[PDB]
Amino acid sequence: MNDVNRIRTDIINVAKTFGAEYSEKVLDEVFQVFGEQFADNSFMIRTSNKQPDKLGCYFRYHEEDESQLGLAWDIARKSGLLSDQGRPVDQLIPEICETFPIMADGVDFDVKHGLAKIWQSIKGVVPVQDAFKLSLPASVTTHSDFLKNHHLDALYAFGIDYHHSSVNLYFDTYHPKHHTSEYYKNLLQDLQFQPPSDELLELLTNNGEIALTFNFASPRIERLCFYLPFLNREAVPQNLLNPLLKKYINEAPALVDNPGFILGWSFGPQGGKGTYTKVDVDYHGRTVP
Template sequence: MSEHPESADLYSAIEESARLLEVPCSHERVQPILDAYADSLPSAVIALRVATGTRYQGDLDWRFTVGREVDPYAVALSNGLTGRADHPVGALLAEIRGNCPIAGYGIDFGVAGGFKKIYVFFPPDGMQSLATLAACPSMPRSLADNMEFFARRGLDDRVNTFGIDYRHRTVNVYFGALPDACLTPEGVLSMTRELGLPDPGERMLRLARHSFGIYASLGWESSAVERFCFAVMTSDSASLPVPLEPKIEQFLRGLPNNAADSRFVYYAGVSSTGEENYKVQSYYNWQPRMLDQMLLSDSGTTSG
């Protein structure tokens, strides 16, 4: 397959970001992803994300949006980006497409590891209910097992994004328009303790107060919520109490950026492994429509 101009230009930025973080960049894994979705790239929101913690060492994630008219899993299969899964994860996107209105999709990949995830964005005025999602035959049972937990906190009908991780065979459920009670230190501790997760540290509790979204990671192997995370947007990468390694701070200062304004999304979470993780997402190409998708206005960003 020949390279498209848009995907070739983006690959150069991806390669530069990998060099800055000193991680390997695999042309044979990355370029086919960009070429497969090349028609979407000129109008896409494009971002990259770096994370702390042993789970994320040795790779750097990039992601971009594609339109709702695209079947992103079919594209991935037909271009050999992922193998056909003999597992319910392979049928899940088609079932969601058949049952829910969709605003668009996102593709997530590592510069070293290649294709990883597909995100499903629901319309801002059409957030989905957990009951609708849990009714999909291939959905992990863990979602239904935790519905009552989310319903008691007013989150059962506030799913604005859903992620499918084909590599790890897990799903992410993203909630928006959060009730204030979910963001207080007491509310956060109540949730993590009921889920059997470690108590977040003081820095994470302070950050959670500013969250525009939370998400939970679940799998097919057990009913446990594997990770529970909070997301905060800011215009200043140094404004929040997030303990980033000096190497990552230097990386953020040197990033390629085509966006007209600077925006960063921080993710802070606790996991069943006992590890506290922080991730920061920087936008290579920002589109204002993402504020609607995130259920945010410009005033919804924080400076600390």
């Protein structure tokens, strides 16, 4: 119903409040094809401090209704919101669906630039080596031993970023080392990424998902991401947050009195790009639990 319009209104108010580059011409075209999937599925609105003074704004949804799997890529292609510009990421979603059983779908949207990402989550966990036969970046295969050595072993999902022509591999935290802070300090050190704070190293002991980004332009792992859920606003560690992101924890729209959040900590090479914070609000309240 109006549920689509509440959502669209909320995104626009979020961008305007937090200084995110946005286009309504682009938001309209997205909502024409997808607005109903935002009302009917697990749905989150994200901001990130990729720049210190201005948050960018994204909105995402996951489809887990089995009968609807693949519909998102079909309607993104058919609608024209995702074109096939020949780039190496353009074949990845078709390759994934032939190789693995798919259990959930998702697409990510940039509020200025439109459709940014497509997700596929495997039916179950697979050894990351099973992915090596895809046209993934060469940096996945060349890092097979690193992956094994840090138990980034258990692949469960893909993100295909058509904006940055990169690939996120998502790993389940199966190993007892994945619940010790020392592991995350040593992983980040082995990558020569920005070391994390002590507050975050303690929180990371409860960590749930680890993601790594590969791109076709680089022989290097580009960045990694840790993710943690938080049951409501006040559960979120205020001290690890940009005053703009503290604000977002307090004002972010939801269709529920006190929504949960997923936070993401992206780390990149020390002294470079890729080390910032992502804040997703559980807009229906039915995703973090």
